[PDB]
Amino acid sequence: NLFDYQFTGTPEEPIKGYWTTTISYRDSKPKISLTIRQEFVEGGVESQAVLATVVGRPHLQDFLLLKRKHLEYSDYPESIDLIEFGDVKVIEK
């Protein structure tokens, strides 16, 4: 495949109540990655997204593409599907 993947923690073994997954464009430097942090709340899972990227990129489209890969890789895609671009923290290196 064409993406790099990592995770730290899981829903069954969260790290201080959180777990995170990161998916990135292979060989990106400065790195293009989307990190999704999840935690249990009453009735479901709450997701927060950070797009680490670079000045000039089409952040919306990068976000949408990495979001689709997160949907296939996460354990609670319904919670990630709710994230809209306006909610994403964008860090341009």
Author numbering: 1800 to 1892
Please give me the paper's original passages concerning this structure.
The two genome segments code for four viral proteins, the nucleoprotein (NP), the glycoprotein-precursor, the small matrix protein Z and the large > 200 kDa L protein which harbors the viral RNA-dependent RNA polymerase. The L protein synthesizes two distinct RNA species: (i) the antigenomic and genomic RNA as products of genome replication and (ii) the shorter capped viral mRNAs during transcription. To initiate viral transcription, the L protein presumably uses a process called cap-snatching. It is assumed that the L protein cleaves host cell mRNAs downstream of the 5'-cap structure and uses this short capped RNA as a primer for viral mRNA synthesis. Here we present the crystal structures of the two terminal domains of the CASV L protein: the cap-snatching endonuclease in the N-terminus and the 326 C-terminal residues, which, by analogy to LASV, might play a role in transcription.
To further substantiate that L-Cterm domain 1 has no influence on the conformation of L-Cterm domain 2, we crystallized and solved the structure of the isolated domain 2. This structure was refined to a resolution of 1.8 Å. CASV L-Cterm domain 2 also crystallized as a dimer but—due to absence of domain 1—with a completely different and much smaller interface compared to CASV L-Cterm. The protein also appeared as a dimer in solution as shown by SAXS. Superimposition of the isolated Cterm domain 2 with its counterpart in the full CASV L-Cterm structure shows only small differences in the loop upstream of W1818 and no major rearrangement of potential cap-binding side chains, even though B-factors are relatively high around the putative cap-binding site. Co-crystallization of the domain with m7GpppG, m7GTP, GTP or ATP did not result in additional electron density. Again, we did not detect binding to m7GTP-agarose of the isolated CASV L-Cterm domain 2 nor a thermal stabilization of the protein by m7GTP. We detected a shift of the RNA with PB2, but not with L-Cterm domain 2. As neither a monomeric form of CASV L-Cterm (deltaC) nor a dimeric form with a different dimer interface (domain 2) binds m7GTP, we conclude that the dimerization of the protein and the presence of domain 1 are not responsible for the lack of cap-binding activity.
